[PDB]
Scaffold this active site. Structure first.
Site, mmCIF file in Angstrom:
data_model
loop_
_atom_site.group_PDB
_atom_site.id
_atom_site.type_symbol
_atom_site.label_atom_id
_atom_site.label_comp_id
_atom_site.label_asym_id
_atom_site.label_seq_id
_atom_site.Cartn_x
_atom_site.Cartn_y
_atom_site.Cartn_z
ATOM 1 N N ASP A 45 0.843 -1.213 0.000
ATOM 2 C CA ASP A 45 0.000 0.000 0.000
ATOM 3 C C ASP A 45 0.870 1.252 0.000
ATOM 4 O OD1 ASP A 45 -2.945 1.071 0.527
ATOM 5 O OD2 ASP A 45 -1.660 2.135 1.946
ATOM 6 N N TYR A 50 3.022 9.768 0.344
ATOM 7 C CA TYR A 50 4.022 9.139 1.206
ATOM 8 C C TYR A 50 5.445 9.445 0.795
ATOM 9 C CZ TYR A 50 0.009 6.210 2.530
ATOM 10 O OH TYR A 50 -1.226 5.773 2.927
ATOM 11 N N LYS A 79 -2.508 6.100 -4.392
ATOM 12 C CA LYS A 79 -3.665 6.916 -4.070
ATOM 13 C C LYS A 79 -3.502 8.308 -4.665
ATOM 14 C CE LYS A 79 -3.952 4.436 0.385
ATOM 15 N NZ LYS A 79 -2.495 4.366 0.643
ATOM 16 N N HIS A 112 -7.573 9.279 -2.031
ATOM 17 C CA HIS A 112 -6.978 9.133 -0.692
ATOM 18 C C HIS A 112 -7.914 9.647 0.395
ATOM 19 C CE1 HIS A 112 -2.697 8.971 1.232
ATOM 20 N NE2 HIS A 112 -3.591 8.745 2.182
HETATM 21 N N1 LIG Z 1 -5.822 5.866 3.487
HETATM 22 C C1 LIG Z 1 -5.277 6.635 4.596
HETATM 23 O O1 LIG Z 1 -5.685 7.753 4.837
HETATM 24 C C2 LIG Z 1 -4.265 5.972 5.523
HETATM 25 C C3 LIG Z 1 -4.063 6.432 6.759
HETATM 26 C C4 LIG Z 1 -3.190 5.760 7.569
HETATM 27 C C5 LIG Z 1 -2.527 4.658 7.107
HETATM 28 N N2 LIG Z 1 -2.699 4.235 5.844
HETATM 29 C C6 LIG Z 1 -1.988 3.045 5.261
HETATM 30 O O2 LIG Z 1 -2.093 1.983 6.347
HETATM 31 C C7 LIG Z 1 -0.662 1.637 6.717
HETATM 32 C C8 LIG Z 1 -0.842 1.138 8.173
HETATM 33 O O3 LIG Z 1 -1.410 2.109 9.053
HETATM 34 P P1 LIG Z 1 -0.391 2.907 10.047
HETATM 35 O O4 LIG Z 1 0.806 3.538 9.350
HETATM 36 O O5 LIG Z 1 -1.230 3.824 10.862
HETATM 37 O O6 LIG Z 1 0.290 1.860 11.060
HETATM 38 P P2 LIG Z 1 -0.215 0.464 11.787
HETATM 39 O O7 LIG Z 1 -0.314 -0.593 10.710
HETATM 40 O O8 LIG Z 1 -1.403 0.749 12.678
HETATM 41 O O9 LIG Z 1 1.104 0.155 12.684
HETATM 42 C C9 LIG Z 1 1.410 1.033 13.740
HETATM 43 C C10 LIG Z 1 2.771 0.652 14.296
HETATM 44 O O10 LIG Z 1 2.675 -0.855 14.729
HETATM 45 C C11 LIG Z 1 3.980 -1.272 14.877
HETATM 46 N N3 LIG Z 1 3.982 -2.695 14.511
HETATM 47 C C12 LIG Z 1 3.854 -3.374 13.363
HETATM 48 N N4 LIG Z 1 3.839 -4.679 13.610
HETATM 49 C C13 LIG Z 1 3.996 -4.784 14.960
HETATM 50 C C14 LIG Z 1 4.066 -5.980 15.633
HETATM 51 N N5 LIG Z 1 4.021 -7.334 15.210
HETATM 52 N N6 LIG Z 1 4.195 -5.957 16.976
HETATM 53 C C15 LIG Z 1 4.270 -4.754 17.597
HETATM 54 N N7 LIG Z 1 4.209 -3.547 16.904
HETATM 55 C C16 LIG Z 1 4.070 -3.591 15.557
HETATM 56 C C17 LIG Z 1 4.751 -0.508 13.777
HETATM 57 O O11 LIG Z 1 5.969 -0.053 14.257
HETATM 58 P P3 LIG Z 1 7.430 -0.601 13.615
HETATM 59 O O12 LIG Z 1 7.475 -0.022 12.263
HETATM 60 O O13 LIG Z 1 8.482 0.036 14.553
HETATM 61 O O14 LIG Z 1 7.358 -2.083 13.546
HETATM 62 C C18 LIG Z 1 3.780 0.655 13.388
HETATM 63 O O15 LIG Z 1 4.548 1.916 13.462
HETATM 64 C C19 LIG Z 1 -0.045 2.796 6.551
HETATM 65 O O16 LIG Z 1 1.396 2.621 6.409
HETATM 66 C C20 LIG Z 1 -0.633 3.281 5.131
HETATM 67 O O17 LIG Z 1 -0.068 2.424 4.097
HETATM 68 C C21 LIG Z 1 -3.566 4.872 5.021
HETATM 69 C C1 LIG Z 2 1.577 13.791 6.651
HETATM 70 C C2 LIG Z 2 1.494 14.488 5.294
HETATM 71 O O1 LIG Z 2 1.031 15.801 5.424
HETATM 72 C C3 LIG Z 2 -0.342 15.954 5.188
HETATM 73 C C4 LIG Z 2 -0.918 17.199 4.889
HETATM 74 C C5 LIG Z 2 -2.291 17.325 4.667
HETATM 75 C C6 LIG Z 2 -3.111 16.197 4.753
HETATM 76 C C7 LIG Z 2 -2.511 14.974 5.053
HETATM 77 C C8 LIG Z 2 -1.155 14.843 5.272
HETATM 78 C C9 LIG Z 2 -3.346 13.763 5.132
HETATM 79 C C10 LIG Z 2 -4.872 13.950 4.989
HETATM 80 C C11 LIG Z 2 -5.774 12.776 5.469
HETATM 81 O O2 LIG Z 2 -6.799 12.645 4.923
HETATM 82 N N1 LIG Z 2 -5.421 11.814 6.493
HETATM 83 C C12 LIG Z 2 -4.192 11.878 7.268
HETATM 84 C C13 LIG Z 2 -3.088 10.896 6.895
HETATM 85 C C14 LIG Z 2 -3.228 9.760 6.107
HETATM 86 C C15 LIG Z 2 -1.927 9.171 6.086
HETATM 87 C C16 LIG Z 2 -1.561 7.886 5.361
HETATM 88 O O3 LIG Z 2 -0.699 7.094 5.825
HETATM 89 O O4 LIG Z 2 -2.193 7.627 4.324
HETATM 90 C C17 LIG Z 2 -1.134 10.012 6.858
HETATM 91 C C18 LIG Z 2 0.340 9.831 7.153
HETATM 92 O O5 LIG Z 2 -1.856 10.998 7.288
HETATM 93 C C19 LIG Z 2 -6.410 10.796 6.777
HETATM 94 C C20 LIG Z 2 -7.427 11.398 7.738
HETATM 95 C C21 LIG Z 2 -7.099 12.247 8.794
HETATM 96 C C22 LIG Z 2 -8.349 12.559 9.405
HETATM 97 C C23 LIG Z 2 -8.554 13.454 10.627
HETATM 98 O O6 LIG Z 2 -9.630 13.422 11.270
HETATM 99 O O7 LIG Z 2 -7.621 14.202 11.002
HETATM 100 C C24 LIG Z 2 -9.300 11.870 8.655
HETATM 101 C C25 LIG Z 2 -10.800 11.880 8.890
HETATM 102 O O8 LIG Z 2 -8.706 11.219 7.697
HETATM 103 C C26 LIG Z 2 -5.305 15.369 5.255
HETATM 104 O O9 LIG Z 2 -4.545 16.276 4.529
#
Ligand SMILES: NC(=O)c1ccc[n+]([C@@H]2O[C@H](COP(=O)([O-])OP(=O)(O)OC[C@H]3O[C@@H](n4cnc5c(N)ncnc54)[C@H](OP(=O)(O)O)[C@@H]3O)[C@@H](O)[C@H]2O)c1
Ligand SMILES: CCOc1ccc2c(c1)C[C@@H](C(=O)N(Cc1cc(C(=O)O)c(C)o1)Cc1cc(C(=O)O)c(C)o1)CO2
Length: 315
Positions: A45, A50, A79, A112
């Site tokens: 992903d 990113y 995304k 996204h």
């Molecule tokens: N669509 C969006 O808006 C959005 C938003 C947030 C995230 N995402 C995608 O979802 C991915 C995952 O979400 P996230 O970045 O919030 O993190 P997460 O998957 O909730 O992981 C959080 C932390 O868990 C730790 N971790 C992983 N495996 C572990 C294990 N077996 N045991 C203990 N700790 C563990 C990791 O640290 P270490 O790295 O130190 O292992 C990580 O920093 C993101 O990288 C991104 O690709 C998308």
């Molecule tokens: C860090 C880069 O700088 C910026 C700058 C502007 C900006 C974003 C990031 C991201 C946006 C966004 O949509 N996110 C935040 C997000 C997603 C991820 C990922 O890993 O994909 C990460 C690292 O951050 C999701 C979300 C937040 C909330 C909330 O309630 O705050 C809600 C409802 O959704 C907003 O705009």
């Protein structure tokens, strides 16, 4: 295992999350994406946001070149960032992501977030007050541009992220809709289990994909430090001890058993390999109900700025 999407393509039910905060050098994304593929991840992903699509793409190419995988074995998601919602910006944004990753297509292209931002080169355009600058875009027209990307073969599947029910309905009820979203990638974990949204998505044959399934990276820019730490939850820790697994593995398996596709970010080799053991054990129905009881409506991502956005999904 995979899940069949509503356009007939297949998506692996465990995906590797690639986001790391800007203080982490980009060389790390290249290294750990290789490790993830080595460990058995096939769903990767990423996103324009990113600042790692070049490194993730290099990792995929390197694992193809040593014969570990073929391109068709990898499910790569990118995304569309929120400054590119205006429809004429969508296909160029996808082509730019493809050029950076040195890929011919993505398996999945997502909107996204519904929260549109001022177009331009800045990821986070801000005014003289420090306020990020919103834009107003009909996301049905963004979706029409996504559909053209699928028809052109640049994205095998298209979907959305951070949409609520009403926003999904707006797409699903669009006149002349060609392709439904295959998925809605949203924050989902035992403290925010999205059971209502999950039931809605199930009824529309839309896959819910969980992010922050391990409780998020707790980035100080987005996460209250006083928020409870998911992986220290006493119920998750007790189930981890019963199953001789870890709390992270319980959190991941919970999603798999309720029909959610689950992402897991780790930049640590041993934890990357640990997460693939989610396929090695099962939770009982009593275990699943115990985890279902943990819901606290806790969204780790909480920015007050964005809470004022007209398309903020948690209003
Ligand atoms: N669509 C969006 O808006 C959005 C938003 C947030 C995230 N995402 C995608 O979802 C991915 C995952 O979400 P996230 O970045 O919030 O993190 P997460 O998957 O909730 O992981 C959080 C932390 O868990 C730790 N971790 C992983 N495996 C572990 C294990 N077996 N045991 C203990 N700790 C563990 C990791 O640290 P270490 O790295 O130190 O292992 C990580 O920093 C993101 O990288 C991104 O690709 C998308
Ligand atoms: C860090 C880069 O700088 C910026 C700058 C502007 C900006 C974003 C990031 C991201 C946006 C966004 O949509 N996110 C935040 C997000 C997603 C991820 C990922 O890993 O994909 C990460 C690292 O951050 C999701 C979300 C937040 C909330 C909330 O309630 O705050 C809600 C409802 O959704 C907003 O705009």
């Amino acid at each position: 295992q995979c899940v069949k999407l509503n356009d007939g393509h297949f998506m692996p039910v465990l995906g590797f999350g690639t986001y790391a905060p800007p203080e982490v050098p980009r060389s790390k994304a290249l290294e750990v994406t290789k490790l993830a593929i080595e460990a058995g991840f096939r769903h990767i992903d990423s996103a324009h946001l990113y600042n790692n699509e070049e490194q993730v793409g290099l990792a995929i190419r390197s694992k193809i070149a040593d014969g570990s995988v073929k391109r068709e074995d990898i499910f790569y998601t990118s995304k569309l960032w929120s400054t590119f919602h205006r429809p004429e910006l969508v296909r160029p944004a996808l082509e730019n992501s493809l050029k950076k990753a040195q890929l011919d297509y993505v398996d999945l292209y997502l909107i996204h977030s519904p929260m549109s931002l001022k177009p331009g080169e800045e990821l986070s355009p801000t005014d003289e007050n420090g306020k990020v600058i919103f834009d107003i875009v009909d996301l049905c027209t963004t979706w029409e541009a996504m559909e053209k990307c699928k028809d052109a073969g640049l994205a095998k599947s298209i979907g959305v992220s951070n949409f609520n029910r009403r926003q999904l309905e707006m797409i699903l009820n669009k006149p002349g809709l060609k392709y439904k979203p295959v998925c809605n990638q949203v924050e989902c974990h035992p403290y925010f289990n999205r059971s209502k949204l999950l039931d809605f998505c199930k009824s529309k044959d839309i896959v819910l994909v969980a992010y922050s399934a391990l409780g998020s990276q707790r980035d100080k820019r987005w996460v209250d430090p006083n928020s409870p730490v998911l992986l220290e939850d006493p119920v998750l820790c007790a189930l981890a001890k019963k199953h001789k697994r870890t709390p992270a593995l319980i959190a991941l398996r919970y999603q798999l058993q309720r029909g959610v596709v689950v992402l897991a970010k780790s930049y640590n080799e041993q934890r990357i390999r640990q997460n693939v053991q989610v396929f090695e054990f099962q939770l009982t129905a009593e275990d699943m109900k115990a985890i279902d009881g943990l819901d606290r409506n806790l969204h780790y991502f909480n920015s007050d700025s964005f809470a004022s956005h007209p398309n903020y999904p948690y209003s």
